[PDB]
Design a protein around this ligand. Sequence first.
Ligand SMILES: Nc1ncnc2c1ncn2[C@@H]1O[C@H](COP(=O)(O)OP(=O)(O)OP(=O)(O)O)[C@@H](O)[C@H]1O
Ligand SMILES: Nc1ncnc2c1ncn2[C@@H]1O[C@H](COP(=O)(O)O)[C@@H](O)[C@H]1O
Ligand SMILES: [Ca+2]
Ligand SMILES: [Mg+2]
Ligand SMILES: [Mg+2]
Ligand code: NA
Lengths: 749, 133, 734
Amino acid sequence: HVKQYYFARRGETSTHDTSLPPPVKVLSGRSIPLKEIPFEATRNELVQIYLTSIDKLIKSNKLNSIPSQQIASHYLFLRSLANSETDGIKKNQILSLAKPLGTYLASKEPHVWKMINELIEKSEYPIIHYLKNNRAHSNFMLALIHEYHKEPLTKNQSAFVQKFRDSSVFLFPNPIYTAWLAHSYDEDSSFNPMFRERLSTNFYHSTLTDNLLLRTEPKEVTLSSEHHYKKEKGPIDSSFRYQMSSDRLLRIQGRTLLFSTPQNDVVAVKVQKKGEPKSTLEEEFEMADYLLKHQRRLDVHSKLPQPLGQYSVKKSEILEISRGSLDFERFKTLIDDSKDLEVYVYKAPQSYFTYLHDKNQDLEDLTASVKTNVHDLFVLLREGIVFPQLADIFHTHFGEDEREDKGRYQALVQLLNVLQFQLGRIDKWQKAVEYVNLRSSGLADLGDSLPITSLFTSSDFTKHYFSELLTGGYHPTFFDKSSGTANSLFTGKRRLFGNYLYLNTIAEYLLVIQLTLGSYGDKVTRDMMDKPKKEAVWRELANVMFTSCAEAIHIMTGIPQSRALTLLKQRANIEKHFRQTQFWMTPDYSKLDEDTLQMEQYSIYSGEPEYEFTDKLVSGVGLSVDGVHQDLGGYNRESPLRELEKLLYATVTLIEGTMQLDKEFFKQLEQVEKILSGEIKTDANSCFEAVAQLLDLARPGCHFQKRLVLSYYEEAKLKYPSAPTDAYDSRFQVVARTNAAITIQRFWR
Amino acid sequence: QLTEEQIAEFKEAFSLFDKDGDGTITTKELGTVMRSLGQNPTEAELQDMINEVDADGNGTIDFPEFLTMMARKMKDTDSEEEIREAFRVFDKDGNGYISAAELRHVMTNLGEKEEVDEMIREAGQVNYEEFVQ
Amino acid sequence: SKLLENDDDVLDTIKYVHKEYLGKPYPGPRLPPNEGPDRGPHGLAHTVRTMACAEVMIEEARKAQLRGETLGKAKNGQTLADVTPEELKKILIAQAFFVVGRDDERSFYAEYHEKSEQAFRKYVEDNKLIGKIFKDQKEVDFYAAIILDKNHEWDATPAHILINQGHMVDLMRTKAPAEVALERTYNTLKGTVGSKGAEVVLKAHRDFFFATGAVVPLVNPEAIDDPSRGGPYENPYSGEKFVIVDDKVPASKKDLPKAVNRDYKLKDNERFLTIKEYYAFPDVQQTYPGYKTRLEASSYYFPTPFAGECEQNPAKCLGAIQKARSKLQTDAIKNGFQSSSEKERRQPNMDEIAAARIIQQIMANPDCIHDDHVLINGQKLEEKFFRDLLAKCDMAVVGSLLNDTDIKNIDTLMRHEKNTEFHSTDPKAVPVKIGDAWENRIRTKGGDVTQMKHDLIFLMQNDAWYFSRVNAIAQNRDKGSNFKEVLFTTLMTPLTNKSLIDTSHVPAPKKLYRGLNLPQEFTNKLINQSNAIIANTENTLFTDLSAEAFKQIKLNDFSQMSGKTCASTTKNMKLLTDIWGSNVIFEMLDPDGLLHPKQVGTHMAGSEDEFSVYLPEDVALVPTKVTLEGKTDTGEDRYIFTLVAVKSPDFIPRHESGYAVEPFMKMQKEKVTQALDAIEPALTECGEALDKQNVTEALQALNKLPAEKEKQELTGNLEPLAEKIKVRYETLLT
Ligand SMILES: Nc1ncnc2c1ncn2[C@@H]1O[C@H](COP(=O)(O)OP(=O)(O)OP(=O)(O)O)[C@@H](O)[C@H]1O
Ligand SMILES: Nc1ncnc2c1ncn2[C@@H]1O[C@H](COP(=O)(O)O)[C@@H](O)[C@H]1O
Ligand SMILES: [Ca+2]
Ligand SMILES: [Mg+2]
Ligand SMILES: [Mg+2]
Ligand code: NA
């Protein structure tokens, strides 16, 4: 009977734009100020322009000149917008605007009218159900605006249009967009954020996440006074000392001496590094104790280290005890130069010192270890602890100190930068994870952490690695000579960057997992000949990656892992991911001629453009700038792992969209409860519309939410016994039938 | 114990009704969770549940405690009458007639989704009291 | 012209029909399959080849119509050049199902097509295409009737002609007397798409055969390989033959006797007409183009393993067809000009060394510049000299020649200059003091010449007031520029090229994009020139039309719009389409690596994928297609021109030499005269004075001077200092 709860709470703030660099650009000695373009106001005025354009279309009598698909789209969107509206005048105006379209559709095209009526009877926002397929790739609102609106667009509207031209869903109001985004992952959805224009193929999976994030409110995490980062921990002054024994020395790795114990465990002594002070060691000690104490509350599955002491020893002793090691010189150069070195002593099992990509693990042990590591990572993220140093993933090393990302890899580079369009190459991806802080037992380097609030403020980490996001976005085309400012939508993220960095942290965790799995697969299959089993290895690794993403979704949102995996597989293809990881993470392709490499790439990228690169392959390595260590992608090119990017964006989008959909559902629920209990006086039709709307905002694949909505509907029917309910009876009957079927299937056992 | 599907549903509902995501829900929204899971409580019983557990002063329930409370509430709440309520939902006519093909279709497409070919065998008129045996 | 290798509809249709039916062996009519379960002669590759043939026929009919030729009409009266792209998509979706319902190779036909039509109905009913792809049941039943082919009316509608002729062209392989089969196919094609069009269709589809690893027989109208056998005429598709008299072989096709069925018994020692004798007739020679063409064979006699690979992978077959039909057009373009020995930039020529030396001298002493000329020890260089130097010198090699001193001497050059440089494209901007801007803003404190290179490149990329004027002067299209900015253009272009060459070290992309903003009249002129070039690039099977392609290309080439200037390009078209808002885009393809792009590193947003191209003298950008991809933000039409870079000595402009040497020789004479008059003993002087006097009468001569010299600076300065053409010209005259 121990309470299992987190010490961190979630809430909202007005803005993250507090105590961060001013919005200016110093270009050629000139200060150019930077300003924001309001997303919501621009979107709303664009919708108003669309309504006026629809009025013009009605007056112009050219309904028969337009395809029936566009007329159906306009009609369904108008009905959905009228439903979402609250003001009576606006709702009536929109309904009158839609009436002639419905009359025409019923008259001259009954076939589509039948499906329109089905959708109207099936949902309160029929447009989202109508658009969950390739139809969404057609921008009917923008087409109508450009056709019937002769006045030029303002600079704000032009910017909004040039950033969000892919689809009309980007112009929907918040609840409708959130509902459509949530339902686009459903089982009966064929939507894919990709369309093939005449020249090339346009992927815009990241634009969905950007348009979602621009609609949210700033997030705050509040840490309880009992939290590790809210406590004035006392001194670590202790009397315990460890007895060095060169006889018992198991080995040396990095800056750590491993000695055996009669209990079959390992005592590890971590010697101070050159530049790191005592603060790092004491912080690691404190974090280890904090995690060990609270393991039951947080439900962490890792075999956590047991610290023993953090004190100072003579360097000569360290040298004397490590004489017989096979790696004595490297250890000598690593450790500090002072005569007395701070050390941190702990006790851990054998598996704590074997990296998760070790080749001496069978697939089942690797699966278990990966599951443990992912669970611990994301549970601790929910606890308010971030691990920005699991691995050292570098995009590039050339101008590292000059460029604003400092050469660090950004898993969501499209969201965090101006005029970046897709993920770049990974420099020496093998050695990025060779000393990864994920082990066969669980998390290892616990001291190298940050509070989660460090992401939502202008801390040293945020200011060091994300200054383009914190400062603002500048480009010469943004400059407005009339005002002298640079207006872009990117600067508007100054008040929300915490959410972006949260999603980036999740994506980077998953990317580290992917690279570790790839390294394991490459090492295992390097000395193998039987091709089918070599393929089976990579197929299993792909399944593990997808399961890890689904587990992350389940922990962050609460969706069951099976449904999370189904929703993920809707948007990301495991076959392509397996093929691409197998192709690019091994050196085989380096032994092929141009024609053969292209012929195989045809099979790797099924239905998509093949990876293009002009780099010269290194024999036995592949793509490598330094000529020794392979890297993922050509120089100045994007990454060849397309399904990996799709999977990362699908994961983060699912998490954030689920949270936003929950918020919308609960505000609608509060309105419904107010109406039912009497604080709002309205006719029966209004109450029925409110409950139907609530039914539309429920989570896809979740039933208990619809159960609550149906109970509210029945209460409403009791409240107004003398009103018709023909419109909503069908959908609520479907809900009731599902409830009964579930009850029967349950009672069977 | 509870079923795996039941535990998954309870966990998802608990997460959905945990507004600030600390791992616990307050007393105000416990009734909403109960109603959401089908066990709509009376005012007296709901007030009893609010007072008894939350007299600790903290006023929050963690997931294991919620599981215990629901397992208790489900110890004796669903007798055979509630079980046959769902069977009667399909009762288009009062004769207790349901085509077995209709049961197969509803159990496959409209519910949890090969099991039906074995369920039906143990199961054209399907009298309701016949099967609940 | 259009390529439907991008329409997702047809791709998923192919994937479907392969997954269900085209990917399965023959089950038989059951009965034993005549040829066994192979599904080869009618598998997936056959259908894809037929669809590609239909696409090529559409394109070729369009090009023939544009050239100004009249095409055959169907019963409906609609030529093959009047098929809208959505109509073509529908026709391809229909054609994918033409032979899906085949269970055996035996000639039955009705049942097979009934099964294929049933499969078509099932597919078009199980994917809701009735409301999305097709309009209504009317058109679906129309295409169902097309697939069924109940009657042999094959020329009523464009779809009829396309499907039937594609099937015939793909089945032409199996016909026994290959020569007459090819002749019949050519005549059938030319009845609808013209002569040149039929020839290009046949060549493209033979290349399709080879690409997918099919077996192609030997065609020999002359019967050269066969010593003395000779093949009987035996016109296939009918089986008819011609019977000759003892020795009265007709001199022409007109006097031949009536046709006889396949089943005929020879009498009175008669013989059948021979293929070789048929193709000796003057009538066929004047009416048939391929009466001597010899298309050899496929070396293999059984289908290659690549055909099997294609059978269970439509992607590989589609890729092979795409490569084949792209290299066809590329070879057609390249066949009209001479070959290129190499790809790298040319070595310095005579005048380029003198030009580089003069530029270096001007760098050394800015005082030589004057308000209206340059004074180099007597020589008075005027803007015309610098202009023709820009218009007759390859500034990339000049920039390569210059050593590292000039980059530093830029400091003294800008220090001595505080003049005015005007913004070209718009006259309502503010004049800028180039030297003050360089010393204050552009230049950065510290840094070695390795940093001045970057500063110069940054100035070139940004500062519209600078590069607009510089590009206008370089391309000789400016309006009212003074002497100082002309001189600055001439000096900076080679130095910018040197900085780009030294600083850039990344691999060169093969595709580049360039954005331009032009009036609609100029765009229409460009479109007309592009269409003229495109419609005359033909890879024919029988006849050679290289001369016509050469003429049309050399008459309507607009590759000078990109030459003479360090043109900026981006390898990300999205950047041009979205933010830069350009109404014209040039897409430059460089598969051979003939452009040498250099990365422009300016540390600005989106600029990592920006490169600078300086078009070589002997490279031309030949259009290959023109596309209308939507509209700009304003609303005007956006046009994309795809260009292929082709290198050939047929593009070099003939420049009279000595432009940069004559003034250089005058300068050397001035130096010699200065030194000699300063020398002003006699007995000892004579030995030197004799050669010092003899050196002076060069008068455009360089050999004797070093011999006279054998004033060390002046000698150190002096030291660095067939059948196809005749055939094409005869064709042009004739
Ligand atoms: N297992 C190892 N084997 C060899 N060299 C290593 C190993 N681990 C680290 N090193 C080297 O030692 C350097 C310093 O170690 P580092 O700072 O990475 O330790 P750490 O991550 O805190 O250790 P741990 O995860 O074991 O607690 C590294 O940069 C690397 O060069
Ligand atoms: N930090 C980063 N992590 C991952 N990809 C990046 C990063 N920065 C840029 N990219 C991408 O890498 C490619 C090269 O860009 P750059 O490195 O900025 O010249 C482009 O596709 C960029 O979008
Ligand atoms: Ca809570
Ligand atoms: Mg570590
Ligand atoms: Mg560490
Ligand atoms: Na790179």
